[PDB]
Amino acid sequence: ADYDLKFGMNAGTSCNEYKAAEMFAKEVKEKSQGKIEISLYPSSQLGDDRAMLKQLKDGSLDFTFAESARFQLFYPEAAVFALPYVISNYNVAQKALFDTEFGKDLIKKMDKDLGVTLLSQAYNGTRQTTSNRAINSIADMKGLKLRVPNAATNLAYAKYVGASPTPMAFSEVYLALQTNAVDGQENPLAAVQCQKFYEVQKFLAMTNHILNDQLYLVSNETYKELPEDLQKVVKDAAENAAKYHTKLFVDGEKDLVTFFEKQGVKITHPDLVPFKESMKPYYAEFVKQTGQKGESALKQIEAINPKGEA
Numbered sequence: 001a002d003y004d005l006k007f008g009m010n011a012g013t014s015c016n017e018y019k020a021a022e023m024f025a026k027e028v029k030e031k032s033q034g035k036i037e038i039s040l041y042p043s044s045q046l047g048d049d050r051a052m053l054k055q056l057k058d059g060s061l062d063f064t065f066a067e068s069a070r071f072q073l074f075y076p077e078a079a080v081f082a083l084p085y086v087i088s089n090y091n092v093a094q095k096a097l098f099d100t101e102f103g104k105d106l107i108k109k110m111d112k113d114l115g116v117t118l119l120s121q122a123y124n125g126t127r128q129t130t131s132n133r134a135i136n137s138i139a140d141m142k143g144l145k146l147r148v149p150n151a152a153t154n155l156a157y158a159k160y161v162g163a164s165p166t167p168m169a170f171s172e173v174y175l176a177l178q179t180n181a182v183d184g185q186e187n188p189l190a191a192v193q194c195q196k197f198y199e200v201q202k203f204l205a206m207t208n209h210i211l212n213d214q215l216y217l218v219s220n221e222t223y224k225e226l227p228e229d230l231q232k233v234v235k236d237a238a239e240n241a242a243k244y245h246t247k248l249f250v251d252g253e254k255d256l257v258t259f260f261e262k263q264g265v266k267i268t269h270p271d272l273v274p275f276k277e278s279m280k281p282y283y284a285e286f287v288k289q290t291g292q293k294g295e296s297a298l299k300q301i302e303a304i305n306p307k308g309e310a
């Protein structure tokens, strides 16, 4: 307890994100000879991820998770990461961030403007849609009161497929599902399982609409005060946690549909061509709203070859 550091997250203690942060935490403690202890604060105990990003910026929190897409809060063209159906697989998400001019500049702005250092990137699942009635095709989204996070790209997903979006914090979601204050939500299969949303949702549609990555972030105010050896400890441990993280989500996606079926959830596979078609005006509005910077970021993402990690 030379450094008593803290890691906040929206995920709960059953979740892949917690499990991976636990590995991060335990490895940092070991490979730092006990000089660094990391405590974990899940389930939004410190606020949502907008609050925790601000806490990293002002140095009041040491570590947290964010998606690349979340930086649309500060740079609207960064929403390109979460335009539904634009990023096809995790390979694309990795190259969008690290192997494009747009993404390399985002990392630099994250450092110089927002005070956060990007330690590592993991895969955080592809979002699906649960509901209290079957989504057999895009038609069934009409009138669906669909909970979304407080995030404009999730809002737009629900809106352009014809649903009625209802933003609310992740910690509020189980209650709203349980009482039918909303008709459904959208999250990767992992969250549907670890947050027990399947207990309170009879239907799951494979909409595959947004791919989530996950960034291991550290406050610059924290990172700068660590000796270089301990900086290296934290970076190595972040990278090792991220590979564990990704494997948890990949393996889970081979598996969880079966699990949910055992629980009595009905799985549908709606035709996704009309879903993808309905986003085309949204892409246009994005480019209209964000200008050259958004158009250029989108062209850069679109050109990435979906095949082969890097």
Ligand SMILES: CC(=O)N[C@H]1[C@H]([C@H](O)[C@H](O)CO)O[C@](O)(C(=O)O)C[C@@H]1O
Pocket: 009, 010, 011, 049, 065, 066, 067, 069, 070, 148, 149, 150, 151, 169, 170, 186, 187, 191, 212, 214
């Ligand atoms: C790093 C992080 O906190 N991810 C969280 C995301 C993002 O906030 C959202 O996708 C916008 O970026 O929202 C959830 O999926 C949600 O509330 O449904 C929970 C998840 O834990």
Ligand SMILES: [Zn+2]
Pocket: 160, 161, 162, 278
């Ligand atoms: Zn329409």
Ligand SMILES: [Zn+2]
Pocket: 257, 267, 269
């Ligand atoms: Zn299937």
